Amino acid sequence: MNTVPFTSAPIEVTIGIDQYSFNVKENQPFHGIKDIPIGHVHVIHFQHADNSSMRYGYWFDCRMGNFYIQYDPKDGLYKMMEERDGAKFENIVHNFKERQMMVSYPKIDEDDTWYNLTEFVQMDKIRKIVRKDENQFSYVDSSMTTVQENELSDPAHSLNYTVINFKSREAIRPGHEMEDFLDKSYYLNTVMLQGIFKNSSNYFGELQFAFLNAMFFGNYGSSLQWHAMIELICSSATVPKHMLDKLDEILYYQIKTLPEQYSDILLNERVWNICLYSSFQKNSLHNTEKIMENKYPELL
Amino acid sequence: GAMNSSNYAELFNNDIKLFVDDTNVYRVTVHKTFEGNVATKAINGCIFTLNPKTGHLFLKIIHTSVWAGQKRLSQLAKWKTAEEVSALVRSLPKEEQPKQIIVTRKAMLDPLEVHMLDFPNIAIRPTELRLPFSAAMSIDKLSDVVMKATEPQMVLFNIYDDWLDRISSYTAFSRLTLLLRALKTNEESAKMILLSDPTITIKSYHLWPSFTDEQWITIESQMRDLILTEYGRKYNV
Ligand SMILES: COCCOc1ccccc1C(=O)O
């Protein structure tokens, strides 16, 4: 189990770690988060008490280095940094743990939620969506726009999700206009899966990462990408059975996880009604349909 | 965006544009079968593609053979319309290609946009005008060429005859829509108005009779009376 120490906590802030969160008071003796499960990506996120503007945070994998958080009073935010001196870092952690200044990642043993939400999410793929090659961790915030949003403005600060556009030459083979528009199987299987993503695992990893950025940061472009990647599958008549079954699991846990009160802003009625009740795959998502019907019946 | 009464003069400016009406593409009669079920029989149809500035009408005749063995024909008809409009645009020289295509029914927007992806600078627009172009098949010479067709065919007409020698496009389009609205509302009475006077004939190369300016005024008034008369009959006014 790994540890992200904090140098200090000079401003009052709500700190998230994956699906958990806790409040830290101004100048509280808080020095980090311990017992972080090895084997998954994680996200440590922030919302300042005095300015809920900009939720922001960092995706990281403790297998890739020793990371800590330090507040920068000039740029006004908690920054992730890497410590390259291993013995320095271990000595810092040990002192803070001995003085019990750290919260423990509060994972219940029966609880597979975080694995279920990040099953296909890899740090190497995150670092290609979020381009800042000098760090091993990736900063995301509520306001970052996607490459697609920009085309429709600072490119170094974009979310480089794969562009999906149902009315584009990429999606529609000349001479197969009606066919490809009404059945997106070509676009899904040849263009996206065989061509761009290489396999379904990378596709699901991006879908899962988009959901998580939408949920944890309220990043609107990420929500658009999440819905587009769902709609592309559901609007395809020909999808491998293993992908349909995996998608049902993926969406179930995302719907299991979403704040009941954020449903109005994180769920697109058109996409979900189309996907569950009109699309080719309207009968292939039994677990997701069950929870969507019982948890959010208004949206439908 | 959408075309309405507020931007109506745009139809007669110098940017080439076409209206596309698909309401006569897929035409059926419904009938009982021997076993007492119901079946359709298709009849030849047409795409009505009109330049409202010049009166040029590109009448693409849709022969019933295009439906043979196809399913979901009302859906297919929209995509076939968009395919044929796209083909028409590609067939025109660059300087004759439209800058805008206005579809009379909003269901044509996605099929046409998808077929026109190679032309990102041609705007595809809906309209809030209720245009009477469905009544094109009440024009005897158009109906005749569609029904006689034995294969797909494109036939070119000027739907304004020679009117633009004497009136503006705006006025010609107004006359056209009044005539078509009258033919849609009461076809028999409208045709009676147009032929009531044997001494006024339709030239071989025309669609409508050769009325003088003063006779057009009388005819237009009679068409408005017909439309109003039918409105009163409909709503008991
Ligand atoms: C904490 O969220 C409460 C979950 O609310 C539900 C309501 C109806 C059906 C399923 C759920 C669920 O997620 O199991």
- Closest ligand 1 atom, CA of A256? 13
Contact between chains at A178 and B117 (C-beta distance less than 8 A): no
Q: Which two tokens stand for residue A57?
A: 């945070």
CA distance B166 to A249: 71
Q: Which residues contact A157 (CB under 8 A, 6 or more apart)?
A: A144
SS (H, E, C) chain A: CEEEEECCCCCCEEEEECCEEEEECCCCCCCEEEEECCCCCEEEEEEECCEEEEEEEEEECHHHCEEEEEEECCCCEEEEEEECCHHHHHHHHHHHHHCCCCEECCCCCCCCHHHHHHCCCCHHHHHHHCCCCCCCCEEEECCCCEHHHHHCCCHHHCECCCCCCCCCCCCCCCCCHHHHHHCCHHHHHHHHHHHHHCCHHHHHHHHHHHHHHHHHHCCHHHHHHHHHHHHHHHCCCCCCHHHHHHHHHHHHHHHHHCCHHHHHHHCCHHHHHHHHHHCCCCCCCHHHHHHHHHHCCCCC
Task: Report which secondary-structure segment, H or E, holds B120.
Answer: none
Q: Which of B71, B114, B119 to substitute to test the interface with A, most A CBs within 10 Å?
A: B114
Counting every residue written for chain A, the total comes to: 300
Which 8-state DSSP code applies to residue B176?
A: H
Bridge partners for A21 per DSSP: A16
Q: Which CATH architecture has domain A116-299?
A: Alpha Horseshoe (1.25)
3-state SS class at B24: coil
CA dihedral B161, B167, B170, B174 (to 10 degrees): -60
**Protein residue closest via CA to atom 11 of ligand 1:** A295
Q: If you search the block for the tokens 């295009």, which residue do you land on? A: B66
Task: Report which secondary-structure segment, H or E, holds B182.
Answer: helix B169-185
Task: Report which secondary-structure segment, H or E, holds B38.
Answer: strand B38-43
Give which of B16, B20, B15 is closest to B92, Cα–Cα.
B16
Q: Which of A168, A170, A177 to substitute to test the interface with B, most B CBs within 10 Å?
A: A177
Contact between chains at A177 and B83 (C-beta distance less than 8 A): yes
CA distance A95 to A145: 40
Number of Cβ pairs < 8 A linking chain A and chain B: 23
Give which of A228, A244, A225, A258 is closest to A287, Cα–Cα.
A244
CA distance B80 to B112: 10
Sort out which chain A residues have CB atoms less than 8 A from B111's CB and list them.
Answer: 177-178, 181
Q: Are A243 and A230 in contact (CB under 8 A)?
A: no
Bridge partners for A14 per DSSP: A23, A47
Q: How far is CA A120 from the centre of its chain?
A: 11
CA distance A37 to A108: 11
Give which of B17, B84, B76, B80 is closest to B51, Cα–Cα.
B17
CA distance B187 to A241: 57
Q: Are A34 and A97 in contact (CB under 8 A)?
A: yes
Bridge partners for A42 per DSSP: A60
CA distance A47 to A232: 33
Ordered structural domains, chain B, with CATH:
9-163 (3.30.420.230), 164-237 (1.20.80.40)
Contact between chains at B111 and A177 (C-beta distance less than 8 A): yes
Q: Which two tokens stand for residue B154?
A: 């494109």
Q: Chain A residues contacting B, CB < 8 Å?
A: 167-169, 172, 174, 177-178, 181
CA distance A80 to A95: 20
Burial class (CB in 10 A: 0-12, 13-18, 19+), A174: exposed
Q: Report the Cα–Cα distance between both ends of chain B, in Å, rounded.
A: 37
CA distance B143 to B46: 9
3-state SS class at B117: coil
Counting every residue written for chain B, the total comes to: 237
Which experimental technique did the depositors report for determining this structure? X-ray
CA distance A185 to A237: 6
Q: If you search the block for the tokens 């990043």, which residue do you land on? A: A219
Which residues does ligand 1 sit against, CB inside 6 Å? A 256, 260, 291, 294-295
Q: Which two tokens stand for residue B136?
A: 């094109």
